[PDB]
Amino acid sequence: MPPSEFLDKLMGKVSGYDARIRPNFKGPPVNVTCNIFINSFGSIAETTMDYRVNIFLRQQWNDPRLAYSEYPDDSLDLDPSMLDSIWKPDLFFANEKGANFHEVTTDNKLLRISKNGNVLYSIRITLVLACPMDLKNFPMDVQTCIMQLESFGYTMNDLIFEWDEKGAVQVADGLTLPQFILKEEKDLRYCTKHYNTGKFTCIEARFHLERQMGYYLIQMYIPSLLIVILSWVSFWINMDAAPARVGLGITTVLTMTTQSSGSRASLPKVSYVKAIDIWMAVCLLFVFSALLEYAAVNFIARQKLFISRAKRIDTVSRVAFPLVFLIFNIFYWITYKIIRSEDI
Amino acid sequence: MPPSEFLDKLMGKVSGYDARIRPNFKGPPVNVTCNIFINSFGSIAETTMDYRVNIFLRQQWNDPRLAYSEYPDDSLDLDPSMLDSIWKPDLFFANEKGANFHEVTTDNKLLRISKNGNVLYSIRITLVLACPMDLKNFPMDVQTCIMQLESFGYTMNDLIFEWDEKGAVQVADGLTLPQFILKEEKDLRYCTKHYNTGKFTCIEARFHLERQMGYYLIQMYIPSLLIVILSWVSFWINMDAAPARVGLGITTVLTMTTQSSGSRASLPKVSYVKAIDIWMAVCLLFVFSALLEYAAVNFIARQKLFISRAKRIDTVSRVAFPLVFLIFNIFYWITYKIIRSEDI
Amino acid sequence: MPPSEFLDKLMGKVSGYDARIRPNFKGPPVNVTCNIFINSFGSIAETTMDYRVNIFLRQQWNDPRLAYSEYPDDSLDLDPSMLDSIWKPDLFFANEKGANFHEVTTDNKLLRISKNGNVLYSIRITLVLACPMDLKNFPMDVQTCIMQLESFGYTMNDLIFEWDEKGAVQVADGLTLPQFILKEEKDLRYCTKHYNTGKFTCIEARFHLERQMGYYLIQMYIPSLLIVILSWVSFWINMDAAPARVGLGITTVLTMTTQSSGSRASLPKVSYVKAIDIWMAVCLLFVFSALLEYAAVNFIARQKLFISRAKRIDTVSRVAFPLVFLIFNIFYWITYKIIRSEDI
Amino acid sequence: MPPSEFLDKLMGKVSGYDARIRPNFKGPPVNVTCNIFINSFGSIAETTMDYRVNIFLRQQWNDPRLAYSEYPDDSLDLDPSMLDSIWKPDLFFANEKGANFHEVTTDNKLLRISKNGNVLYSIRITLVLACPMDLKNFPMDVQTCIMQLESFGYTMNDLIFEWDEKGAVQVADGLTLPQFILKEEKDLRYCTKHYNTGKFTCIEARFHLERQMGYYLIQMYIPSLLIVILSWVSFWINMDAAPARVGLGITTVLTMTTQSSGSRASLPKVSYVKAIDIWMAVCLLFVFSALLEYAAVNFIARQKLFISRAKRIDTVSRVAFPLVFLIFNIFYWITYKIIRSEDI
Amino acid sequence: MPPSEFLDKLMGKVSGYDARIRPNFKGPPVNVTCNIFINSFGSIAETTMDYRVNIFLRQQWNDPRLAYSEYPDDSLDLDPSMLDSIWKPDLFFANEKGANFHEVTTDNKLLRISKNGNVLYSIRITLVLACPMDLKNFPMDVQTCIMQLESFGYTMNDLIFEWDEKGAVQVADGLTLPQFILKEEKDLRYCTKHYNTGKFTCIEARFHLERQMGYYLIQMYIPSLLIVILSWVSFWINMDAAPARVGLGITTVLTMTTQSSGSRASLPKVSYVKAIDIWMAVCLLFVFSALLEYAAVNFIARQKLFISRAKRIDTVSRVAFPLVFLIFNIFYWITYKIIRSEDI
Ligand SMILES: *[C@@H]1O[C@H](CO)[C@@H](O[C@@H]2O[C@H](CO)[C@@H](O)[C@H](O)[C@H]2NC(C)=O)[C@H](O)[C@H]1NC(C)=O
Ligand SMILES: *[C@@H]1O[C@H](CO)[C@@H](O[C@@H]2O[C@H](CO)[C@@H](O)[C@H](O)[C@H]2NC(C)=O)[C@H](O)[C@H]1NC(C)=O
Ligand SMILES: *[C@@H]1O[C@H](CO)[C@@H](O[C@@H]2O[C@H](CO)[C@@H](O)[C@H](O)[C@H]2NC(C)=O)[C@H](O)[C@H]1NC(C)=O
Ligand SMILES: *[C@@H]1O[C@H](CO)[C@@H](O[C@@H]2O[C@H](CO)[C@@H](O)[C@H](O)[C@H]2NC(C)=O)[C@H](O)[C@H]1NC(C)=O
Ligand SMILES: *[C@@H]1O[C@H](CO)[C@@H](O[C@@H]2O[C@H](CO)[C@@H](O)[C@H](O)[C@H]2NC(C)=O)[C@H](O)[C@H]1NC(C)=O
Ligand SMILES: CCCCCc1cc(O)c2c(c1)OC(C)(C)[C@@H]1CCC(C)=C[C@@H]21
Ligand SMILES: CCCCCc1cc(O)c2c(c1)OC(C)(C)[C@@H]1CCC(C)=C[C@@H]21
Ligand SMILES: CCCCCc1cc(O)c2c(c1)OC(C)(C)[C@@H]1CCC(C)=C[C@@H]21
Ligand SMILES: CCCCCc1cc(O)c2c(c1)OC(C)(C)[C@@H]1CCC(C)=C[C@@H]21
Ligand SMILES: CCCCCc1cc(O)c2c(c1)OC(C)(C)[C@@H]1CCC(C)=C[C@@H]21
């Protein structure tokens, strides 16, 4: 007979199936297997603190009833329009800004009922998940994107869902994300929302993102360093050349001020301090201190002992400033590597 | 018997329940308990003057009728699709740009009816609430976000709602807001909209936000200060070096003009004066005044008394300018601390 | 009897009410009283030329029929879902980019029917109204926002609507608009759209906005002025200092070019000239002319008469340039004040 | 009798009107008169290549049937909700990114049926039309916006539509567009989409836009010119002043590099060359060539014949560079005026 | 008889057509011909990694049943509203961010049934397709846009679709894309999604985009080159002019730092290195090295042999630096041309 009408027979008014009643009512909890496939991952935004994913949610659960066992066909495909008839678990996302279904040509929803009573339900969804992130160490940060599936109004005694045994989370290859790189650990855990009403089920899949330092290393870090090196040539310039040294020193100060001012527009718009800010502030200190010594030495030589003292101060700061800059660099880089390692 | 049909019996045409009639009609006012849980708080925008929240609205009210008292089950869960049947209070938000419900998989709406007649109604909502804010003192400002729930068309004699006794407003931990920090006071009050028709009920929960000065202190405030210090070295430079002093002074003026020009792009786009604007204007004054004195002293020495007078002017402005800058700094910081303390 | 069913009796098929037929058909025009309350005003955008408002539209009109006169209740509240039953005037907005209703929890629509037959209809709407604006004088401009309500397909003989006698337009206090200030005149007028088909009714409420000059005065106007003052110190610098004067003059030219280049990013993106553009162009002229004279005087003194002539040219331009700048400033400010006064 | 029911009689099941069948089936083509009124024109975006319009589409066509000829009323107004009943021509827009109807209070749709059988159908629509545009000559470009109405699935033998005889396209006064100016020619033409299936009807109204050169002339063009003039003063400066000339020349090069760098942010983000780019490149050449000659002359005089040769080179390039710049300016402006004239 | 009712006869309950059953059930696979017409291509966004297209999807398939063969008309046009009746293949797009239908006036859907049983189905769709792209070589990159059509839930034994024999993909002329140029190869291939359930059909059309180097060549590449040339004039400047050389060298360093800082705002916001970044870093090296040699030579001459050695170093670096810059340029350009050729 026509396959669709057989389904009508199964879920129709004649037979006592009420879509509003959980399978195994007043009984053992319904177990739901969950499989997630990520088509596209991207659009991470630091300001609004959300990223966008397109996924293929796949729930598997067993229904005691709705087992026909008298048909040649081994499975039945329900029409996507009349999806109200089957009881579907109310699975939502705890950290959801907004999500909607797809209607490109037909509903991207597939439901298949096996002979024994297994139900396979697949839904293609696009989601704006909200993940808290921080930029304490902005060039070298490892953010974690948390995706959590939780029930709405059903307790542990009623509905339980957990991850599939193998291949629970899969990702289509070649994401080519603009800033971060998606790692392949994809660790899975459990959450149990303990509320006043009772325990609620939750499962959680998190993803690790590691930010690439290509543009960050080549721009900002390398030019600042070079400008500090060019700041130190004033030491090697003879003391008598007052216009040449004053002009060079102030111009280098202007140069770094322009570099920082230009780079902040590219940088994220946050209010707490970051690592790049510390680096820029330290470079401003180095250029500023190098100008100050020139004005601290020229005063000394106009008022032959003073000449000797001035040249001594020149040579001392000549070998002092690179070595102190090296000590700063070693400590700064070591500290950030240790802190990122601690994070991971 | 099947739980759903029992509900049908209760709210069906057979029994006289009209969803359009308030419980306790022509009687004492219906009291509605209100609980709010904030999943996510963020996306504060100074231009459009709105912020976005995702909440879990939870209304509790007592209905005299709809009390079954003849069933084993202690509570009944109504289907979210057929929510028209129950009478729901028309609670809206007075300051709403836009809001919509969630349909991730199923309706994020739960309604539960107790044995006695208590109704528990939970709705997950995302809201764009509008809060007036001001930036009279932009780096150190404390804005208040006002969330107010008001009735639509029901008077105090008909419908009254107030906050829950304990845990009325709850916030999920780890917001990690980009600029502000959410405080934990969360004070609650009442409003009564007195109109021509009559008094209308309203309850109001406000949140205090304190802006972090990390990036604001490290960038702009610290470099400007350093550039003013480098402006004062021209005093210590000998008078005879006309190219060195003129070049240094104008270059410092250029340097601050570039810093202010770069920083305004990062700053908010408002038309009234702020605190950072006062600081930048004052620094421009300091660099400008320091150039002016050099051109006021060089004229004096070309026309031995004049030489003495010139060197006197040099030494006087040498000890004058830092001390006056210190007096300005003390007054500026003290005034802003007092005004922010007054605000809080 | 139940209040709702009484309404059913009134507007049901049994009685001859056809919602598609105007009250007083083939008769005197229906008069509609209109009241507007502005919850929020903001999001003025110069590029797309639209602003966003949230309002409380309140239409009052009298219906000859639908007068019950046999009930204890003095008014009847119709269910918002079944609003098709009553005849509602088709009032639209002539300058509408986009508008939509609110569904925060329930429909924000209230309709109340009095005993005599008065109908009170209240709708909360958010609107993107389009108002033409211009920036001929950008820092000192007074734009007018025009809100106009017009009928759609009904002539003057059929439907007429006008403003309420008192309190026709009300605004909630504390808008805190980022750039403009909303004035309180709120003048009301009439329009009659004379078309080929006939006269159509329209009423119009306009709002006056005055742009604050805080940030505009403190930034751009004040630094440019100071840079022009620093440009004139080259006159007081001795002629013999060729590196000092050439360096100072070109550096000041660079300084203003940087200020204008930075400020244009903040400024609106329009193609016609404004006032700030005239001010920046004039300042560029002043710096350019001051460099030109230095190169016009140095040539004169290398080829003792020439020395005297050169020093004469120096002193003449020394007292010339400030006074001419003052004459420009007086004319520019006076002209803009007169033109803005003419506008208002 | 009630006017609405008369319409029911006309289009009801009793009478044989099938809304799915074209008027004059198996007969002469239906002729549709088309009238367009533009409420608002704006939001031209060069990146996405689309502009937004709000229009009043007005189709007039004659229906042989649906002529009552037995009623006092001379016209009948159909309810906007039940618009499925009448047969409406399937007119779409060939170059449409997105469009939607308006629901401000009621449907902005009016349909009126005359006594003889003329049908007047008016729809208010907002449209995002896509028009290809180019910026070969960006400051002086004349873009054309093409609006084309075409049938969907109906051939010339079935459905033909053309423009109204007089006042086919009308525009509400005072657009105040930010960059372009809308011209009043508004020329109308025909298109016939010849496909594999057959000829399809189309009518096309295009609009001419002329870009204002106010801000473009005052900023960028005028300062660059002035900086080139200030570059040439180095020629008049004496050869012996090596710091003054080298400093001035390089500073002018820096000045133009800053102006171009600042202005590109304001300019459109396209990849092909424009006119402003040619102007900036040419100015960079002029400043660069003027620095090169100074370094080409100073070498000559250190190695009395060489002194004479150097001063000769100075005077020659002194009168050479302005005149060559003038020749460039004349050719550049003449070429752009000719090309824009060719376009129009 | 009326054409529509004949269709009703064909697909009505009386005849056994169940829209939920595939044509040729339990039989040979249904073959679907696919034709795509691109109205508009644009809005390529590097950040979110998606582009927007407006297309005319045209599916052709043969249905054994639904062949009337007793009517004068050679084809039947089904009403777009009642499209549920016919069985439509569930064709979706594998890489879809979001897509929706058009409702400008009527549904942009046409279905025509031939006499034999061929079904022609045309749908106008706007799509946000997601294509991975990379910017390893940003000025000279060739990205590929992949459009793939795949079935949802139907295996190869059930449903197969492939491209039309001729004119499978067509593009309307005159795209005028802002950055890329669309090529005309438009190569077609197959994909077969091998899953756990079975093989699924897919067809794939890709488009080649070549980025124009107009603005990229004229701006950034040409000025940097010129600034490096102006950096080398310091070699030709005499050694004794310490203020002139130091001032020129540092000013050129400042000039390039400003150019790079300004240009990054225009450039895409990605984290990995690009080609333009390498070019800017190399130019910073050239200016930095040229300053370093001046400070490496001046030290040598203050401590007649040293004078000779200094002048030797000057001449050596004078002929060294251009030639090394030439070697770099040749290698850089050759490498990028080879890599782009490899890509294509
Ligand atoms: C879902 O899985 C849970 C896992 O705990 C099952 O619960 C256990 O079932 C076994 C088998 O009957 C019992 O031995 C345990 O006592 C159960 N534990 C609890 C805590 O109930 C549950 O049976 C599964 N659901 C179904 C429908 O089989
Ligand atoms: C809702 O709470 C209000 C609080 O005022 C209750 O009103 C009071 O009820 C008590 C108990 O009967 C009376 O003694 C007071 O006279 C009431 N005050 C007023 C102003 O009416 C009200 O009864 C509560 N609602 C319900 C349904 O119990
Ligand atoms: C709506 O107001 C108009 C105002 O013009 C009323 O029209 C006038 O009504 C008075 C009172 O009967 C007459 O004396 C005038 O001749 C009317 N003027 C016109 C131009 O018709 C109108 O009656 C009001 N509508 C209703 C329903 O009362
Ligand atoms: C629509 O206009 C067309 C214009 O071509 C009309 O077609 C012509 O009608 C006249 C009058 O009967 C004939 O003399 C011509 O032979 C027709 N030309 C063609 C090409 O058919 C058409 O009749 C008009 N439609 C209606 C319904 O009158
Ligand atoms: C769709 O095309 C496929 C192409 O493979 C057809 O399948 C072949 O049909 C021919 C003709 O009967 C047979 O000789 C082959 O054995 C078939 N191959 C396979 C793999 O089945 C198929 O018949 C076409 N569909 C229809 C409805 O004709
Ligand atoms: C090595 C034995 C005596 C050293 C005296 C000495 C000299 C000196 O010039 C400085 C010293 C210490 O400390 C540091 C921290 C390096 C300073 C950096 C800031 C500036 C302005 C000066 C530096
Ligand atoms: C202390 C006894 C006499 C002081 C004379 C004196 C000298 C002086 O140079 C100034 C004085 C006062 O006032 C202040 C406000 C500090 C001025 C700041 C602005 C400039 C251009 C000059 C400053
Ligand atoms: C007062 C009696 C004779 C005055 C001669 C005189 C001298 C002079 O230097 C100028 C004069 C007029 O006109 C103005 C408009 C002020 C000019 C501004 C532009 C420049 C380059 C030069 C200015
Ligand atoms: C007029 C008789 C001989 C002229 C010799 C001559 C000299 C000269 O300096 C130049 C000449 C031609 O050609 C132009 C194109 C103007 C050049 C512009 C670029 C630079 C660096 C030099 C210019
Ligand atoms: C040709 C025979 C001996 C050459 C000695 C020599 C001299 C010299 O100045 C340089 C040399 C090599 O290597 C290159 C890579 C060109 C250097 C570029 C970086 C700087 C600071 C110096 C350059």
Numbering used by the authors:
A (entry chain E), B (entry chain A), C (entry chain B), D (entry chain C), E (entry chain D): 32 to 334, 401 to 441
Text taken from the publication that reported this structure:
Glycinergic neurotransmission across motor and sensory neurons in the brainstem and spinal cord is mediated by glycine receptors (GlyR) where, in addition to pain perception, they play a key role in respiration, motor coordination, and muscle tone. GlyRs share a conserved architecture as other members of pLGIC, with each subunit consisting of an extracellular domain (ECD)- a twisted β-sheet of ten strands, a transmembrane domain (TMD)- a four α-helical bundle, and an intracellular domain (ICD)- a primarily unstructured region between the third and fourth TM helices. Binding of glycine in the ECD triggers a conformational change across the three domains, leading to channel opening and then eventually desensitization, involving distinct gates within the TMD. Here we investigate the molecular details of THC-GlyR interactions, and probe the conformational rearrangements underlying allosteric potentiation by THC, using single particle cryo-electron microscopy (Cryo-EM) analysis of zebrafish homomeric GlyRα1 (referred to as GlyR) reconstituted in lipid-nanodiscs.
The particles from the GlyR sample in complex with THC alone (GlyR-THC) belonged to one conformational state with the three-dimensional reconstruction at a nominal resolution of 3.09 Å. The analysis of the GlyR-THC structure revealed an overall conformation similar to the previously solved GlyR-Apo structure with an RMSD (pentamer) of 0.45 Å. Notably, the capping loop in the ECD (Loop C) adopts an outward conformation with no ligand density in the neurotransmitter binding pocket. The TM helices are oriented as in the GlyR-Apo structure with the M2 helices revealing multiple narrow constrictions along the ion permeation pathway at the Thr13′ (Thr289), Leu9′ (Leu285), and Pro-2′ (Pro274) positions. The pore dimensions at these positions are below the Born radius for the solvated chloride ion (2.26 Å)43 and are therefore likely barriers to ion permeation. The Leu9′ sidechains in both the structures are oriented towards the pore axis and form a hydrophobic girdle, which performs the role of the activation gate of the channel. As expected, and also as previously seen in the GlyR-Apo state, no ion permeation events were observed for GlyR-THC, even at this elevated potential and concentration, confirming that the GlyR-THC structure corresponds to a non-conductive, resting state-like conformation. THC does not evoke GlyR currents on its own up to micromolar concentrations, and the maximal potentiation is observed around 32 μM37.
